[PDB]
Every structure is written in C-alpha cells, then in structure tokens.
Ligand binder design. Structure first.
Ligand SMILES: C1CN(CC2CCOCC2)CCN1
Length: 460
C-alpha cells in the first residue's frame, strides 16, 4: 500500500444564520453551484480530508456530525472518521478523513481565539485544527470576524489577534505564529469584508449580480483592497471569485438580496458582499492547486450561501533511514553564504538567527550578525560566512529537497523575534551556491528581508 504524494482537501465555510440546515446539503461537498465547480465525473471520488467551518451554527456537535457523516456517506458510500471537532460559541470546525488515513494522521491540536474587549468580546473569533499527515503539517482556521461595512480595520485587527494567539502546530516552533508553522495553512470563514460602494447603489449592485458582471464589484471588495495595500492576509492566496456575493439573501430563496437597514441589522445596510471566503498559504515550492471555489445555489436556510473550495496538496512520507531519525547523516549539510537581514526596525540591538526545521534534531542559534546602515535608512544585519553548518537527520535527496528551514532573527537584548520567514530546500542544484530569499514578518506584518546564498549537500 504506497504512501500518497498528493491528497485532495475540501474546505467548506457556511454562516448558517442560526437556522437548522435543509435535509440535503450534498451540493456543498460536491462543489456544485456557481463559480469554479467540480466536474460531474468526480462526484463519487472522495476527498482525502473534509474541513467544515460553520458560523452562527445552532446545532450541537452531535447533530452536525451526524448530518455531515450521513451526507458524505450518501455521496461516496464511505464512512468518514472524525479527526477533530472544536466549537467556540456558534463558531465550529469539523475535520473528517477517509478511514485509510486514520494511522497517517497524528499530533491533532485544536484551539480558539476570542476577539475584542468587553462590548466586542462575546461572539466573534476563530477556531482551528492542526495535525500531521505523514511528513506534512496541515493547519485550518475558521474565523467569524467583526461585521459591518465600516469595520474593515476591526476585521484586520481580528486577523492579527487570531494569528498571534491561536496555539496550533509544534509548540517547539516558539518564535513562529500559525502563518509559519504548517506546510499548508487554510484560513476560511465569514471574514465579513464587504463591497464598499454607496448605499444608494444597492439596486445597481443587484443588477450587476443578475448579469454575472462581478468585475466592478470585486474592485470594491474590502478583502481584495486591504490585501492589495498589505493591511491583512499578507502572503496568503485566494482563487479568483466567479460566484455571486454569498450575503445577504432572503431565506428560502436565492432570488432576493436583503440589503435595506432594519432594526434587526442595527439600522445598517448589508449591500451584497463576499463575506464567506477561503484563503491559503503553503511553504515555498510545495504543490498546492485550487480545483474549485464557489457557492451553492440550492441551500437556502441561511441569509448566507455555503462556500466550497477544493485543493490538491503535496504531501511527503514519514522518512526512516539507517541513520536519522535519532542521529545525524554526516553525508548531508546545509551551508549559508553572504547572508544578510534587512530590518525596518528603528532599534539598535545586536541580532542572532534561529534555524528551525523537522530535518534537524533541534533548532540552531547563530552568532550575532554585524549591524550596518542601509543607504535608505535601513538596518542591515550581516552574517557573512559566519552562519553554522546545519546537520540534517537524513541526507537522502528524496527527503532533504522536500524540506524547509524556518528563520527567526532575534534581539540579543530581549530574545524576542523581530522577523520570521521560510526557505525551501527544493533547489535547482546541490553542492552549488544558489540565491535564497524570504520576506520576514512579525505578527504577520512585514518587518524586513533575509537573502543570501545556500549550498546543499545530499547523499547524491
Ligand atoms: C498573488 C496575489 N497577490 C496580490 C493580491 C492582492 C489582493 O488582490 C489580488 C492580488 C499577492 C501575490 N500573488
């Protein structure tokens, strides 16, 4: 029975509007409706992993698990195993997997973050799940961010609080937040970003939707505009949107958008918006391909339509050699040449690096770099040829070239990370000096750059 080198992952996000679902929701799991939809010929082919995010979910965990499992069984005739379920208030995440994956899945983590203070603490936040699938780390975040057209800044703050404080993945990766802990990170939910056009344009917007002319609407979508100005979701991807806005519908039809201000909306307009989204971030040069991104047309119990996205994702096997794990392989080494960090910080402390990777027995601390002034004000931290030689646990190129090195630059004074990034070992050549580069972030905001050269020795 060979270990897979690809799996398919289903991501679902649905704000259920505090209403039970209808008796049939199979269209969701089948990626059928509007947008980038799945070929009919694939309908019986199960995804390897189904991750279901709900918001405003009125069901017990038991009630929803029964509906989900019975839905997948009707579609595929496969009885899926429950990997994890985690609920914060009415925000829920369910991970189901094919039974053949039960012994490939380990290190299952769940967490939640509550966003806001006092007034704004009580129903918004995120839940998440992580685990290993053989040699590949997977993370999944379902967030319900602050509502309202005039609160995009609050949403961006919610995002930063969730990525700082959601405790998923390998706790030994202490300088790194969830945006660096996983081979593949999927972040979805009712992100609540709106189409930011004048209220008076509501009927014009509806007209455009009926014509399936989304271009002039997406150019005003707050998530796309905020992403373009690097205010939120820096270094995350989203598939092109080719489905109608998923909010706000009259219930029991999809023929009408309910946008007008009502006591029930706190006298706020809800212009048709793409509230319900799926984004991802994968380590550099790892295969990840979106194969569907769309909304259902036939599930109408909520004022939101369900959104689906499916992905092909590269995975690696749990590698054993004669040597590692449990020793080094002297035939392998990672050298860094002519490296320097460029930092936006106005501080003057000394900095050192930490190298973290599951190809090392444990993380490696460098010597302090040498601080110089950049020609445009910047701090440049030079490491020269001083950086340690990294000693991987396995030298086999079929293992090593699939690995990644996480880099933190830390203050000698405080031991706090000023920047985090990631370098792929999927090089064009071994035993050859090649350029490397990573942006550096902290709390998911750009704080600098790391660049230099790498020289990788494998057993071949
Ligand atoms: C793909 C997407 N890119 C920028 C997007 C920002 C928001 O709107 C769409 C473009 C980041 C890197 N490459």
């Amino acid at each position: 029975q060979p270990e897979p080198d690809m799996i398919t992952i289903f991501i679902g996000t649905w704000n259920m509007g505090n209403a039970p679902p209808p008796k049939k929701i199979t269209s969701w799991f089948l990626s059928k409706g509007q947008g980038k939809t799945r070929d009919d010929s694939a309908d019986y082919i199960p995804h390897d992993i189904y991750v279901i995010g709900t918001q405003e979910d009125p069901l017990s965990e038991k009630e929803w698990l029964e509906i989900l499992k019975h839905s997948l069984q009707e579609i595929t005739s496969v009885t899926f195993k429950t990997v994890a379920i985690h609920t914060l208030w009415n925000i829920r995440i369910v991970v189901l997997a094919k039974p053949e994956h039960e012994n490939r899945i380990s290190h299952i983590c769940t967490d939640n973050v509550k966003t806001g203070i006092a007034n704004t603490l009580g129903n918004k936040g995120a839940v998440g799940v992580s685990f290993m699938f053989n040699g590949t780390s997977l993370g999944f975040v379902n967030s319900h961010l602050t509502s309202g057209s005039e609160k995009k800044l609050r949403r961006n703050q919610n995002y930063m609080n969730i990525l700082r404080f959601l405790a998923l993945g390998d706790k030994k990766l202490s300088p790194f937040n969830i945006t660096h802990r996983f081979t593949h990170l999927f972040w979805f939910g009712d992100l609540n970003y709106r189409v930011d056009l004048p209220t008076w344009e509501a009927e014009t917007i509806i007209q455009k939707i009926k014509q399936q002319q989304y271009a002039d609407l997406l150019s005003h979508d707050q998530l796309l505009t905020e992403r373009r100005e690097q205010k939120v979701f820096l270094h995350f991807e989203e598939e092109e949107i080719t489905f109608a806005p998923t909010y706000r519908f009259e219930r029991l039809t999809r023929d009408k958008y309910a946008y007008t201000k009502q006591k029930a909306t706190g006298m706020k307009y809800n212009l048709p918006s793409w509230c319900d989204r799926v984004l991802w971030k994968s380590y550099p040069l790892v295969h990840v391909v979106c194969q569907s991104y769309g909304s259902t047309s036939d599930i109408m119990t909520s004022d939101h339509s369900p959104v689906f996205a499916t992905f092909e994702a590269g995975v690696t096997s749990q590698f054993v050699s004669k040597n590692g794990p449990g020793t080094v392989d002297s035939q392998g080494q990672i050298e860094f040449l002519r490296c320097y960090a460029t930092l936006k910080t106005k501080s003057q402390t000394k900095f050192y690096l930490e190298f973290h990777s599951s190809c090392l027995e444990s993380f490696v601390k460098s010597q302090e770099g040498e601080n110089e002034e950049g020609s445009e004000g910047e701090l440049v931290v030079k490491f020269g040829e001083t950086l340690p030689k990294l000693k991987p646990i396995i030298s086999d190129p079929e293992y090593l070239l699939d690995q990644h090195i996480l880099i933190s630059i830390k203050s000698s004074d405080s031991d706090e990370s000023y920047g985090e990034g990631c370098i792929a070992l999927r090089l064009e050549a071994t035993e050859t000096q090649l350029p490397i580069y990573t942006p550096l972030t902290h709390h998911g905001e750009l704080t600098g750059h790391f660049q230099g050269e790498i020289k990788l020795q494998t057993s071949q």
